[PDB]
Structure formats: C-alpha cells, structure tokens
Amino acid sequence: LQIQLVQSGPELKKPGETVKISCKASGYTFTDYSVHWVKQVPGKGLKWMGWINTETGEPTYADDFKGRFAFSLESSASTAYLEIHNLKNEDTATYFCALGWLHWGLGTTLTVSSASTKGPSVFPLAPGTAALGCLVKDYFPEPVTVSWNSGALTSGVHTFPAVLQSSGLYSLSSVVTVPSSSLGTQTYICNVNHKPSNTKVDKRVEPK
Amino acid sequence: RLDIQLTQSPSSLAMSGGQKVTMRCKSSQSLLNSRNERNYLAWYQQKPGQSPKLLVYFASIRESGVPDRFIGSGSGTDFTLTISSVQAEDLADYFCLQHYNTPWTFGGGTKLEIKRTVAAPSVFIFPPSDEQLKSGTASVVCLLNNFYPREAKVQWKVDNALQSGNSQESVTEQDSKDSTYSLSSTLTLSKADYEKHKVYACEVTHQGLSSPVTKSFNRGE
Ligand SMILES: [Cl-]
C-alpha cells in the first residue's frame, strides 16, 4: 500500500474570510512523519511554509508565514490542516501538503477575490490559411474549457491563458487556423464550458 | 536554525532538441552531512500548470520513473542538474531544494525551453463582433501565430494614434510539436470610443520579420 495524501478541493474565498484546507493521509503510520506545507504562487516559485510534528503536534513556521497561518492535526483521523485567517488577494495560490521532500499531495487551489461567480459571454472572431476564433469574456472564477467541433478539431488550435481584467473577471480567446478554401464548406463551432456557473455554449463562427 | 540561500543559474535556458543542458544551484552553506555523507539537496521539475515532481534526491540519486537523461551531481555548496539530451517534454521550470537546515529553501528556478530556428509570426486582426457591440463594449483582437523566439512587440494604433494602457496580452506555452509560441493582444474600448474612430491597426515587430508588419481594418467595411 503506497503512501497517500488526499487534499481537499478547490477553494473560492473573499477578502477577510477564513479557509481551512485538509490533508488526509494513509498507507503508513501517521505519527512517523512530519507534515510540511508548501505554497506555490502562479507563475512564481515555491515557498516552504513550515511543518508540524505529528507526534507532538508542535507547528514550526517560516518567517513569512507567522500570524495569519496555522497548522493543526486530527491524529485519530490521520489528518493535517492548514488554516489561513483574514485572507488577502495574495493568498491566491496552490498549497501542497508533503511528507518532506519525498511525498507530496496533489495540491489545493485557493482563489481569493471580491468577484462573484459569473458565466462568460462567447463572441465570434470571424475570419491559403485563415484564422478564426472565439472570445470568451467576463467570467469568474477559472477555468473555462474550449474545444472546437466537439473535440474533432485539434491541430492548429490555440487557447490562450486567461487574463485578469480590472473588473476582476477573467477573459480569454481560443483560435484555430484552417485552410481558407474550407471556409465555405466546413462549419466551425467552438464549445465553451464554464462549470462553476454551469454555462455551456456552442458558438458557430462564420465569415462575414 | 539558519537562513540558507540557494542561487540557481542561469535563470532561463533555450537548448536545441537532443543537445545537453546544464543548470547550477549554489548554496550559501554546505549541504553535506558528515554523519552519513549525504548532501541534503533535491531537484524538482515543474511543468507549466503542474505540481512539482522529484527528479533526484540527496544530490545524485535519480528518482524512479525519471528518464536517465537526468543526472544530478555536485557536493557541499555546488550542485548541477544535467539533461544529457533535451526533449520537447522537458519544457519546465527546474527548482532545487535544500532541507539541511530549517527553514527549508528553494532556489529561484531555471526555466528551460527548446531552441528552434527563428520563425516569423502570422498576424491576424479581428474587429469586434456586432453581438458584443450591443453590450456597450468593443474588443479588438490581434493574433500573432506560430513564432519563435518568444520576444515580440505589439502596438495598437487608432487613427494612427498610438494606444496605451488599454490592451492586454496572452502567450501560449511552447508548442510540443513545432516549438513555437502564439500571442494575442486585446484592445478594449467602450462602444462609444469605438464608433468615434475609423482605422484600427496593430503593428508587429519580431526578429523573424525583416520589417514590422501591420494588419488593420476600417470600421464598417
Ligand atoms: Cl514526527
């Protein structure tokens, strides 16, 4: 039985709130290894947060993580927690529990925003090669998925990483290049899925 | 209890496929434990959008399920990660970790990409759709498609006036097949502003272009 750490699911919070993340362990004697926590900020490095002793229950924090951060345990449940108080936008990150350098969890994603859940609007980017696409505007939170023609069209497809607008909503576009000779014969549909808002859109993109 | 700096270099790297890649991690304190003769240094690979993955531990020991083209070496304060023959799937950020003293510290990472021949982008401009215009906003999209290297400049001109502060850019990860990048620039204007002017253009400057290329459109054609 291989070591297993199960981390709680994606977290969406507003500034000022509190979040408690869980790490559920099995496949070994819980009190044999300390649990470490690691913060990964998107597009940036890794920051070690500190650790908790699973025998004693004593937490040790890295300097940048004193005050708003707390590690704790429920030993009878082989579980470790990270709690963050008084959330700030900048707590937005993925958090990994780990048994040192060796065994990591899949991570827990935390988004801190004053924005409220919202489904995108899908607009066409109308077109020997032509480009066309779909503009997926003003949604929150991430992610959206885009495919083209139910997934049958993959070659030449670029779906851009989303950008955060000032409004606090995200926005992205997805494009594909196809033969210009096909604009008259082949229909192009972008399929947009935004699960948080349960929004599914199919948009026909035709030349004008 | 002692602050240890790890310094990784170079900070970013571009190698041709199949060639050797070398990256360094120097520590401010020796990571060598005289008790057991182990260096408490580990290397991780982290691919765009993924969690970190342990490649080698105790400086030189390859983790199982790590291709043998990865080799960790060095001792004390100087450590090296070598990729004997770089592959497209090696596109990632590489971090070293010291766990000799608390607090544990990561290096700043080395970004690895594939170098390929220079390739000019294909530029496309997209006017706002009539449907978006109905909601009081107008997004104009410029697309730079399949180019290398990554560095590119895009600027918007409305009625030949240079724009500033109103556009946003996004770049794909390196394509695993043709090793290129693509980029979108999105110019955002109120329906109001958009009706005011007539000529919308984006100008692209890239090493693959003998001179800056421009695509443009006139509102209402
Ligand atoms: Cl322990």
Side-chain angles (χ1 to χ4, degrees), chain A residues 57-89:
Chain A
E58 295 183 17
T60 291
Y61 303 103
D63 291 302
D64 288 322
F65 298 99
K66 287 164 184 178
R68 297 193 296 114
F69 301 82
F71 311 149
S72 60
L73 294 173
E74 194 170 37
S75 263
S76 70
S78 298
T79 310
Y81 303 90
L82 168 61
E83 196 183 351
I84 309 166
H85 300 271
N86 297 307
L87 290 150
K88 305 184 171 185
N89 292 326

Side-chain angles (χ1 to χ4, degrees), chain A residues 36 40 45-46 48 60 96 100-102 104 123-126 131-132 135 137 158 160-161 163-165 175 203, chain B residues 1 44 46 51-52 57-58 99 103-104 106 124 126 129 131-132 139 143 145-146 168-171 182-184:
Chain A
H36 300 242
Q40 190 200 342
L46 303 164
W48 179 83
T60 291
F96 298 103
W101 45 271
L102 191 32
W104 293 39
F123 306 114
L125 303 167
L132 53 95
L135 172 56
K137 214 192 180 312
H158 299 294
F160 295 91
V163 298
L164 181 60
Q165 299 152 110
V175 296
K203 175 68 66 179
Chain B
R1 212 174 190 106
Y44 293 79
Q46 163 179 277
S51 100
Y57 59 90
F58 296 137
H99 53 103
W104 288 8
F106 293 91
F124 300 88
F126 296 95
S129 63
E131 186 183 3
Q132 182 196 24
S139 293
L143 170 73
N145 199 63
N146 300 357
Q168 285 179 286
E169 284 189 352
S170 176
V171 191
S182 295
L183 182 147
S184 58

Side-chain angles (χ1 to χ4, degrees), chain B residues 48-64:
Chain B
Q50 276 182 43
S51 100
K53 169 183 164 204
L54 175 63
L55 293 174
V56 357
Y57 59 90
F58 296 137
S60 58
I61 305 175
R62 198 187 303 110
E63 180 55 332
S64 53

